[PDB]
Amino acid sequence: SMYQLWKMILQETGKNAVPSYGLYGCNCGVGSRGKPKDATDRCCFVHKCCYKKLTDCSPKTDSYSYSWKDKTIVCGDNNPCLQEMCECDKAVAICLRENLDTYNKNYKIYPKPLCKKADAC
């Protein structure tokens, strides 16, 4: 569930998801996709295709089980679909986090006509 992914991204990067990423680059948005503007933008792009794998559980509201093994996210729980979901989320939080030094305030609230054709998943 977004709230989970939201907690995840927080303890990971130390930032508020929606605010700093919710509208970032060309992919991060809600119903947006196109050639990624950078490391972070790509992250979102990939986090999208990943979610496109769970055809038996909604990543929006379905809450999966996970923990934090000393500063590290660790899914492992019941069901399988919840897992893919939980695993995608962790790959996003670690992505967005690996490129903090690349976050660009100019993408924070990126227009749209400023984008291009989205890459194929």
Side-chain angles (χ1 to χ4, degrees):
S1 61
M2 39 194 163
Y3 314 118
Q4 284 171 302
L5 146 73
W6 200 104
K7 212 223 247 90
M8 250 187 233
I9 305 181
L10 211 232
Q11 30 203 18
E12 214 47 39
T13 34
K15 324 148 63 72
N16 241 234
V18 207
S20 6
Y21 292 117
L23 239 43
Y24 195 109
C26 290
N27 284 292
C28 305
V30 230
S32 17
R33 261 194 247 172
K35 232 163 115 183
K37 321 314 281 61
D38 60 337
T40 270
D41 200 344
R42 263 197 241 283
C43 296
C44 292
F45 165 61
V46 175
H47 178 259
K48 271 187 179 217
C49 297
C50 199
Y51 265 17
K52 251 157 131 198
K53 290 284 92 67
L54 351 131
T55 41
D56 261 273
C57 66
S58 106
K60 185 106 150 198
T61 27
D62 286 301
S63 52
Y64 45 65
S65 162
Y66 93 95
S67 330
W68 249 46
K69 211 275 255 156
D70 259 78
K71 313 309 130 32
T72 305
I73 311 131
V74 25
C75 291
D77 79 311
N78 321 39
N79 227 261
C81 194
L82 264 357
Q83 187 104 18
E84 329 248 28
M85 182 197 310
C86 182
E87 291 198 334
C88 290
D89 283 353
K90 192 193 172 199
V92 83
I94 286 148
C95 194
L96 250 38
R97 140 103 135 179
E98 218 81 272
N99 336 329
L100 260 175
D101 65 34
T102 243
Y103 188 131
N104 183 62
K105 319 246 209 18
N106 304 359
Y107 296 169
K108 206 149 152 205
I109 315 277
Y110 215 53
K112 192 179 210 82
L114 233 50
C115 288
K116 314 119 277 182
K117 178 260 209 221
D119 307 332
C121 264

